[PDB]
């Protein structure tokens with residue numbers, strides 16, 4: 001199967017995701033509708049259930065709406081069972097129509113459907129080449145009150161019907177009871193309840209094994225990816241350990257939700273996407289596109305710097321899931337705004353690196369403010385809109401032109417309003433030109449590209465006023481006028497000669513696990529695959545074809561390697577770096593060091609004998625650790641994914657910049673649990 005196949009659960013860069021708010025899409029089965037106070041078929045009250053379901057989606061998948069648009073993956077509301085409580089948030093009735101208030105992750109939401117329905121959804125989907133991605137919110141359960149258990153369902157957790165426990169009288173400590181977060185610090189928003197939602201406690205063995213068994217259920221049902229909810233609000237080490245279970249069992253494209261403010265650039269965010277096992281939603285990309293194409297708060301130079309920084313700050317920028325809006329932002333298009341602005345922003349996204357994600361309704365010029373106004377019923381299934389035609393024209397390129405799916409980004413012409421960028425991958429080129437100036441044309445002169453000399457038709461065929469391109473030798477483009485608001489796409493595809501790796505996934509797992517290397521020029525015959533200097537050939541290479549390779553990770557020590565390949569003839573490919581070979585199965589262990597005083601600005605870190613602990617390299621040390629919520633300074637703590645049942649030796653450091661101060665005396669030793677979690681307490685040794 002090629003890289004573009006619907007079966008490729010590891011690669012979503014050749015795809016265009018379509019995010020669906022289940023309740024607000026299409027109610028293909030009124031029988032499952034909630035009733036009375038919780039329901040509103042009129043969908044006039046955006047906080048009540050409107051009735052949308054899996055059958056609605058199947059119906060739309062089957063009647064051509066999605067496939068007509070070229071959409072090739074869908075991201076649906078969390079399928080797990082939510083509470084049934086109708087909560088009055090001060091004179092306003094609220095339902096769990098958004099699938100974020102969980103109660104049982106081992107069952108479905110009757111409103112959406114049953115397992116049978118879900119299975120049918122997956123079937124219908126795969127049959128039309130649309131991958132299926134499900135929201136997943138392992139952070140909390142539902143709204144709860146510790147004293148007032150009569151409130152809602154008390155954030156009660158059920159394991160396939162059996163009560164695990166609830167928020168009040170939480171003796172097992174299945175939940176955290178540290179109050180709510182003010183988002184003041186990263187540890188604050190992790191060990192405190194997001195709003196009033198019962199915060200699950202991952203250090204609890206039950207919680208950890210349960211959320212781990214739960215997602216195996218869904219991987220078993222057939223999902224192609226997972227959209228992790230509120231990743232900045234769950235311990236990171238635990239999350240790596242979650243991704244380890246997933247990847248070491250059944251690996252699937254996973255991206256998390258780490259909200260980034262306007263103009264916000266987080267290294268914490270970058271690091272998470274770089275060493276956690278999952279990519280993330282490109283808020284940086286989204287906010288800047290908005291700033292430039294919608295709010296008019298930054299120009300093309302800002303979008304360009306964004307593209308360049310992001311491309312360097314992200315180990316796998318091609319795994320960041322882009323967008324122009326979503327359920328927590330006002331919808332990109334204002335009733336009063338020039339529709340052409342949403343149009344070019346869409347084209348911009350669809351032709352940019354990463355994995356595009358269109359919020360349901362965008363293509364139908366939907367507008368509205370934040371929650372819940374941005375969550376309305378799709379007022380129309382019209383394939384007769386510019387946005388539609390736009391997505392339909394550009395979405396398919398991510399499959400037929402690798403330059404757009406795996407390419408590099410390079411600016412080739414620019415000013416305050418105009419931006420002409422080139423996407424390149426092998427003998428594949430895509431040049432996109434966008435002029436955000438709604439009232440003025442641009443005189444494009446001296447534009448040079450990588451396009452062979454010839455004539456290139458606007459792929460949008462004039463739709464957004466783009467034009468034909470003329471490229472002489474040098475890849476020099478003839479002078480042209482770039483219409484006010486114009487957007488034109490020019491492209492070229494050809495067979496790649498040398499082996500080129502455009503993608504690899506998963507990017508973190510133990511030896512033996514199978515991995516997918518996608519690109520062009522591999523050739524049909526098995527060749528060689530390298531994890532650093534180690535060669536792997538023949539058998540362990542399960543399948544090999546021109547655009548896709550499937551091979552198991554060799555038994556190399558736990559470390560970070562560079563994946564490379566070479567066709568049968570010995571020709572090597574480029575290096576796809578950042579691969580983490582785990583030391584084996586992962587378990588989340590908490591590390592507490594006591595009386596480790598510091599100076600303001602200096603923080604404690606953990607280092608140890610396995611690569612998961614940085615192999616004694618303080619540069620790769622873990623942290624800094626926390627001393628606010630769970631334990632207080634001078635006591636620091638931290639949850640880390642470590643090799644299961646391994647006997648590890650460790651010590652604590654104190655860094656201030658690259659400057660490090662080793663804990664005194666001897667190394668500590670402990671043995672990781674085989675399953676569940678553990679807690680290692682120790683005093684800092686001077």
Ligand SMILES: OC[C@H]1O[C@@H]2O[C@H]3[C@H](O)[C@@H](O)[C@@H](O[C@H]4[C@H](O)[C@@H](O)[C@@H](O[C@H]5[C@H](O)[C@@H](O)[C@@H](O[C@H]6[C@H](O)[C@@H](O)[C@@H](O[C@H]7[C@H](O)[C@@H](O)[C@@H](O[C@H]1[C@H](O)[C@H]2O)O[C@@H]7CO)O[C@@H]6CO)O[C@@H]5CO)O[C@@H]4CO)O[C@@H]3CO
Pocket residue numbers: 185597598599600601602603626627628633
């Ligand atoms: O809101 C106050 C504080 O906010 C911001 O601080 C950041 C900081 O930038 C981050 O690095 C991190 O802080 C780390 C520290 O780096 C780390 O050293 C440790 O802090 C402990 C100290 O080591 C320990 O001595 C003691 O801190 C003292 C501190 O030495 C005193 O000087 C005094 O601190 C005050 C600062 O001097 C003052 O500037 C201000 O600090 C800002 C800071 O400028 C800003 O960047 O307020 C504090 C307190 O009023 O008193 C404290 C306590 O006696 O204890 C701390 C830990 O309690 O650990 C933290 C991580 O927890 O995060 C903070 C943001 O929270």
Ligand SMILES: OC[C@H]1O[C@@H]2O[C@H]3[C@H](O)[C@@H](O)[C@@H](O[C@H]4[C@H](O)[C@@H](O)[C@@H](O[C@H]5[C@H](O)[C@@H](O)[C@@H](O[C@H]6[C@H](O)[C@@H](O)[C@@H](O[C@H]7[C@H](O)[C@@H](O)[C@@H](O[C@H]1[C@H](O)[C@H]2O)O[C@@H]7CO)O[C@@H]6CO)O[C@@H]5CO)O[C@@H]4CO)O[C@@H]3CO
Pocket residue numbers: 616651662663664665667
């Ligand atoms: O180099 C191979 C070495 O690799 C691994 O060592 C780890 C070690 O286990 C970690 O703790 C950490 O080391 C930190 C120390 O924790 C920290 O205290 C400080 O170390 C200083 C020592 O405290 C100090 O005594 C002196 O170290 C001496 C040491 O006492 C001598 O015994 C000698 O060391 C040899 C070992 O005996 C030998 O077994 C082997 O060590 C392995 C080790 O088993 C493995 O876990 O080789 C060394 C000789 O190369 O010589 C040193 C030199 O005086 O000085 C150090 C530093 O001033 O800092 C270290 C970090 O450097 O990390 C190491 C690996 O980096």
Ligand SMILES: OC[C@H]1O[C@H](O[C@H]2[C@H](O)[C@@H](O)[C@@H](O[C@H]3[C@H](O)[C@@H](O)[C@@H](O[C@H]4[C@H](O)[C@@H](O)[C@@H](O)O[C@@H]4CO)O[C@@H]3CO)O[C@@H]2CO)[C@H](O)[C@@H](O)[C@@H]1O
Pocket residue numbers: 098100137183194195196197229230231232233257258259260261327328371
């Ligand atoms: O309590 C019930 C509410 O739960 C539901 O909200 C969801 C969101 O729809 C999710 O997309 C997600 O989003 C969170 C996000 O995880 C969190 O970081 C936060 O983002 C902050 C950011 O951290 C902060 O620093 C600042 O910049 O403001 C951002 C706000 O955009 O908030 C997001 C959503 O509020 O998780 C929550 C909870 O699971 C449901 O949709 C709501 O209707 C409901 O009230």
Ligand SMILES: OC[C@H]1O[C@H](O[C@H]2[C@H](O)[C@@H](O)[C@@H](O)O[C@@H]2CO)[C@H](O)[C@@H](O)[C@@H]1O
Pocket residue numbers: 411412413414415445446447448
């Ligand atoms: O000819 C190469 C040149 O092309 C682009 O420069 C544009 C520039 O963006 C415009 O603002 C204007 O000045 O015309 C120039 C071309 O004549 C690239 O930006 C630049 O890197 C490149 O060298």
Ligand SMILES: [Ca+2]
Pocket residue numbers: 027028029030031032033051052053111
């Ligand atoms: Ca229904």
Ligand SMILES: [Ca+2]
Pocket residue numbers: 139189190191192199200233234235
């Ligand atoms: Ca949390």
